[PDB]
Design a protein around this ligand. Structure first.
Ligand SMILES: NC(=O)c1ccc[n+]([C@@H]2O[C@H](COP(=O)([O-])OP(=O)(O)OC[C@H]3O[C@@H](n4cnc5c(N)ncnc54)[C@H](O)[C@@H]3O)[C@@H](O)[C@H]2O)c1
Ligand SMILES: NC(=O)c1ccc[n+]([C@@H]2O[C@H](COP(=O)([O-])OP(=O)(O)OC[C@H]3O[C@@H](n4cnc5c(N)ncnc54)[C@H](O)[C@@H]3O)[C@@H](O)[C@H]2O)c1
Lengths: 251, 251, 251, 244
């Protein structure tokens, strides 16, 4: 019952790690808004959660569109009365083609920033009035290990997550006046059901040599820190970045 | 039951935050070794834990004394069969007199390093054989926000906690081969039942101005991250420093 | 003559700190491309440098426009034969009005990112061919102390400089195979740009309270590290962020 | 002439990178105190510097010994009238044999800390009065890439450099009231067989071999007036082994 009587919006929750956040948050008592651009798949996640005794709705959202984001929050409040937790998990990543940064058009740069950076910003704006009204909130933004490691062939993705990482600092200051916390989780090496071109064979060989724990990650490696950050007991932690990376890097 | 069927050694646990770690860990099902330089007072904490339904023993330890440390770990294994968790909380801190660094004698410097840095090192050496044997361990070292903020008049304390901070990185690498994780918690501004001259009134005005969350801290602000780090679910996190500081600094 | 027989492009160089970079790089022997949206004002700066014995041309550039950026690099190579150094100083900051992040429109966010983040990215792309061909390059990107401190009322600016900060890491990896270094300078926000009016004494005392070094800062304080990062003295440094902040924060 | 009319103490300066710091500082106009446990070898460095037209003296110092450290600063002020710059380069490292941390005795830990951490502390104490009186100081402490990377088999060395790293922050605060700056340089630990170079290059962003010239530039920056607004920072010279 780690999240009993709390309401969480998770963007990008129709698949991958965000789906696991939604399922586990609902197992821990949260009423979950499964928010995704893919409404049928988000409905499949929410229906799976409800059929197991949890509370969940699906909400279609384009996080790059301000009125879609506002409608998503409206749907959360209409269903569950409030929003306690926002996890800004939606991102363009799995669909990326690896390419040298010279080959990234300005259009591809902008389109990825619109979801990854602007979209996180817009969602934070949309939950701000409800969290300030209740003088309570947990915002969890999502960066990536590649921000610190600067891995090749994803330079726009890396820059967009750098924007999210810095945004957390600004929002922790501005929203902390109402007790709201804002933190960043930086995952590394998490394998899900969604295939991706992110890490190659030579890329995993390098990662395992650099990691302190010599293994790949999975979703269960992230759920714990998300539960901590979303829960009442993280009340004193804000403006921090927490890396879940098997010691790929040290802090 | 966050720590069910786990055994935790907490040094410096006869008072202050370490006593709260012991009490809360035991409430979550851990068998706790209340280790401290005051054996009767550590016995008082352990007796209180057992009178509430918890599993706990007390152990006298001078963490600067390798033989004393070795007997502490032997006592833990004798009582509870293993050690799963080590919290290196013992430090010279609340007793410190503040002074400009030119006024710190070499003997003052050495005595503080013997407890804070060497003492943490010796405890990690002593639990290494049992954690490697069982291919499992959670080591939590304790630094301090003053390592990053460089507050005045405690230069030897700051340097000793910088040694702990770096030591965590070396140990994460060397012990991760057997799955053991090693992380650092960096508290700030936690008020306990023990008075201390570490922060003045003008110092708190400065801290509250710099913090994102405008309040002082207490022990409940720290227990949650210690439970996460000591628990099975932090398995993918190693070599990290987690600051609990109300946003005094950002990461 | 620390930059003798080197060619340097500086964006946003018609006024403020960028002009000082241009003037000081030229004094140290660099051929300087004074790149700015204001071609007449940039030509004035170039004329001032040349009449004092330096080598400089002006180039009009809209760093958010890929074709304008490409034309700037062509002008540099056509005039001086190569590009050795790129300083991505162009940024929207002085014109910004303080506003809480909820009041920043998506369009305002996008317009600032187009210059601050995308603009730096486009310029790095445009110099990449000439630097790779010559197996030599020094790229200096610019962040700000507000990223680490999370100053309020500039959330989009902060996020855009987080994007630049992370982008430096990606570019250091991708360009370091050809002997090109990429680093970030983070000036104290108070010296981020030349103020229009002199900082009042009361304002200086508020700033000094946060500094470890109790001294007032100015533009000469950034020139030294830029000269280091643009010169062969930094040939082994890449992917780093260097903060010039009188110890406002520590690293 | 970037260090013209300045006086620099460099500990551990009779050999290795410390000797190169001293030589290059003297070339840039500094009056150099070549300080080392090996006074004969340090005298050879000072005489080498002097015969090339620079100003230098040798001072024997055991940086773990407060009386020896005080005699070193007195010798510097006796020769040159002041101390502007202190580079705390003395460290136990090259002699170290790799061993898992379980095998490091408490005595080995203490002996290494006495030089690497306490020694830096004592030298900073000893230059404090002259630097505060003159309202001027550049202190450069030395860490290592192994602190951030957590390389195996050097745990006490790593911890001792973490102590130095944090100490710089405390001293930047306490000495910055008098216009003194305190910063840390973190060199790549590698500064070797070709196979070893290639293993090291694999981890670097910049695919170039490093040497001592790669550290002199940042030391000159941090010892000079060009860094007068920088304090409490750690500057890594590591070819992008890590990013910051
Ligand atoms: N609303 C929109 O406009 C929009 C746009 C694109 C994608 N999305 C949604 O987002 C989801 C994308 O899922 P996915 O499989 O692509 O990504 P995912 O399941 O791996 O999501 C992971 C999140 O963590 C970050 N991350 C970085 N490194 C990681 C690591 N090693 N492990 C885990 N997370 C890491 C990712 O950038 C992302 O923010 C989908 O449901 C999709 O519909 C939404
Ligand atoms: N040789 C030994 O075994 C030994 C030596 C000295 C002390 N100790 C024991 O350790 C305990 C010390 O308790 P205490 O009251 O001095 O410390 P505390 O309970 O206030 O703090 C415990 C730990 O948190 C760290 N810390 C960092 N930031 C802090 C903050 N904001 N507030 C509080 N602590 C912060 C301390 O350095 C220490 O490692 C006592 O039980 C004492 O007997 C043991």
């Amino acid at each position: 019952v780690r999240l009993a009587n709390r309401v969480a919006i998770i963007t990008g929750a129709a698949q991958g790690i965000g789906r696991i956040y939604a399922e586990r948050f609902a197992e821990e008592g949260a009423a979950v808004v499964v928010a995704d651009i893919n409404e049928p798949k988000a409905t499949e996640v929410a229906s799976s959660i409800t059929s197991l005794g949890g509370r969940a709705i699906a909400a279609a959202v384009d996080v790059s569109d301000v009125e879609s984001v506002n409608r998503m929050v409206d749907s959360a409040v209409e269903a569950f009365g409030t929003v306690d937790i926002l996890v800004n998990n939606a991102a363009i990543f799995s669909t990326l083609k690896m390419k040298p940064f010279e080959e990234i058009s300005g259009d591809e740069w902008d389109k990825l920033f619109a979801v990854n950076a602007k979209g996180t910003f817009l969602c934070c704006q949309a939950v701000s009035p409800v969290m300030r009204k209740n003088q309570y909130g947990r915002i969890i933004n999502i960066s990536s290990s590649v921000v610190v490691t600067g891995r090749p062939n994803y330079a726009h993705y890396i820059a967009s997550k750098g924007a999210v990482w810095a945004l957390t600092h600004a929002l922790a200051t501005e929203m902390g006046t109402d007790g709201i916390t804002v933190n960043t989780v930086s995952p590394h090496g998490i394998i899900t059901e969604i295939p991706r071109e992110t890490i190659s064979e030579e890329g995993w060989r390098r990662n395992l040599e650099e990691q302190a724990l010599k293994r790949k990650g999975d979703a269960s490696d992230l759920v714990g820190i998300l539960l901590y950050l979303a829960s009442d007991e993280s009340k004193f932690m804000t403006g921090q970045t927490v890396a879940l990376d098997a010691g790929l890097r040290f802090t």
